[PDB]
UniProtKB/Swiss-Prot annotation:
Residues 20-108 form the PPIase FKBP-type domain. The gene is FKBP1A. Keywords: Acetylation, Cytoplasm, Isomerase, Membrane, Rotamase, Sarcoplasmic reticulum. It comes from Homo sapiens. The lineage of its organism: Eukaryota, Metazoa, Chordata, Craniata, Vertebrata. GO terms for molecular function: activin receptor binding; calcium channel regulator activity; FK506 binding; I-SMAD binding; macrolide binding; peptidyl-prolyl cis-trans isomerase activity; signaling receptor inhibitor activity; transforming growth factor beta receptor binding. It is found in: Cytoplasm, Cytosol; Sarcoplasmic reticulum membrane. This is Peptidyl-prolyl cis-trans isomerase FKBP1A. GO terms for cellular component: cytoplasm; cytoplasmic side of membrane; cytosol; membrane; ryanodine receptor complex; sarcoplasmic reticulum; sarcoplasmic reticulum membrane; terminal cisterna. One of its GO terms (biological process) is positive regulation of canonical NF-kappaB signal transduction.
Amino acid sequence: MGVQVETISPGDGRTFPKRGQTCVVHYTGMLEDGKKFDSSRDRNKPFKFMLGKQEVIRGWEEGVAQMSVGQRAKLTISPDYAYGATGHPGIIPPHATLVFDVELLKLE
């Protein structure tokens, strides 16, 4: 499958990221069993990426583009939109479905 976006808290419902904009997000990344492997919240510093430059997994590019500013959403991402068959040794196993809790704080 692709990426599924499920709302946790609504945003403004009007402002969606366009290609080339910088998205400022807080996120927590979990394996499908619920094990956390990465979180900007634990570092207390938001994560920024430019939409359309493939600095993040494909599931993020397509998923965050469906969020409005201020929204918190749960992204469920199949391995082809993620780290695939290879995964990431010792962090992400092969063929891993990933779950992301993502809050879109602002656009720059």
